[PDB]
């Protein structure tokens with residue numbers, strides 16, 4: 001409410017360093033700033049966004065924000081040109097949706113190969129030598145590589161290496177009908193990983209926590225993680241280097257590059273309080289450093305502080321894997337891409353389906369669920385569950401998109417409920433709700449539009 005900014009950020013980031021920026025904002029303003037890191041906040045936000053229980057500011061990679069923006073869930077970001085010139089232009093590209101800036105870019109993230117120099121002074125240049133490397137390391141009682149296999153964010157670089165892609169980009173924007181998840185490149189990539197499991201070089205149940213504790217206790221020679229993981233490795237007794245990810249079939253693995261961004265809730269009563277903290281407190285040299293001290297940000301978007309961080313060879317390696325990778329689209333159809341790839345990798349890793357059944361299933365489901373967003377606002381009110389039931393698409397990854405779209409539609413009805421009570425609300429979500437509620441909603445919609453002038 002008024003007199004407080006509640007901020008949502010994921011738990012693997014420096015929320016205590018971010019809180020320290022919230023203290024300094026309170027010493028000058030008296031305004032209290034609370035930072036919390038809820039479980040599944042990226043899925044919890046579309047549930048409580050337009051309600052009085054949503055955050056004022058939400059921190060996540062830029063790929064989740066276009067679904068928020070298209071729903072009208074976030075207020076438009078309009079900094080002065082003098083403030084925009086303080087950040088790199090490509091960071092603003094990642095937060096521009098339909099010509100509108102929708103968030104504040106914070107830092108550039110990219111996965112890197114992190115290795116123990118004591119167990120491995122020269123890291124492998126190719127994926128293909130980890131099998132032979134692991135055998136020599138399992139004789140030593142250890143393993144070669146352990147990383148999170150439960151999230152496709154970590155496994156996508158190998159899948160993308162030989163030619164996999166999410167949505168084909170061609171001349172200005174992406175084609176959601178062109179998904180490259182089961183092409184010859186993505187199959188060879190996922191086959192190599194599955195080959196590592198069946199050959200006893202990796203465990204299919206390895207997650208983030210096990211892979212981190214194994215590397216930080218010297219049990220595996222390598223892991224794959226981002227800049228946020230460096231702080232936990234510093235505290236342990238391992239001398240580590242970070243460098244390029246291995247190549248596959250002679251081509252560099254292409255990770256999905258995420259730009260950590262801060263979006264402002266369109267239903268927040270303290271939008272101006274949020275921009276002042278963001279523009280004049282966090283996005284400063286001493287604000288970024290308070291967070292980077294907690295757990296590192298990576299290549300920050302602030303050009304002044306990025307001069308100091310570019311010295312770090314760990315930052316240079318992050319940028320090298322980011323140029324070899326590709327930036328994530330911010331389109332709402334990314335949620336459909338992820339949900340379908342998570343199931344394909346887990347099913348192929350556990351052997352429940354072959355690499356071919358897994359990647360062909362995800363290809364059709366990701367291309368089918370992508371079209372649901374094109375009619376999310378068209379389906380008339382009270383009819384979304386009826387619409388879903390009629391289609392009969394009973395696939396887990398497709399209905400995960402149906403549920404989120406249903407969550408998006410509910411928040412637009414909350415925005416209309418507040419807007420009718422002269423409360424803070426996003427006008428785009430108000431109109432999106434009104435334009436699916438019959439002829440009287442379209443009269444109330446346009447009548448409103450005509451008084452705005």
Ligand SMILES: OC[C@H]1O[C@H](O[C@H]2[C@H](O)[C@@H](O)[C@@H](O)O[C@@H]2CO)[C@H](O)[C@@H](O)[C@@H]1O
Nearest residue numbers: 012061063064109151152153226258338
């Ligand atoms: O897994 C940790 C890592 O996850 C994030 O990457 C996400 C992506 O941003 C989401 O849209 C999700 O659907 O897909 C990926 C997970 O599979 C962040 O990019 C990163 O900061 C975070 O550490």
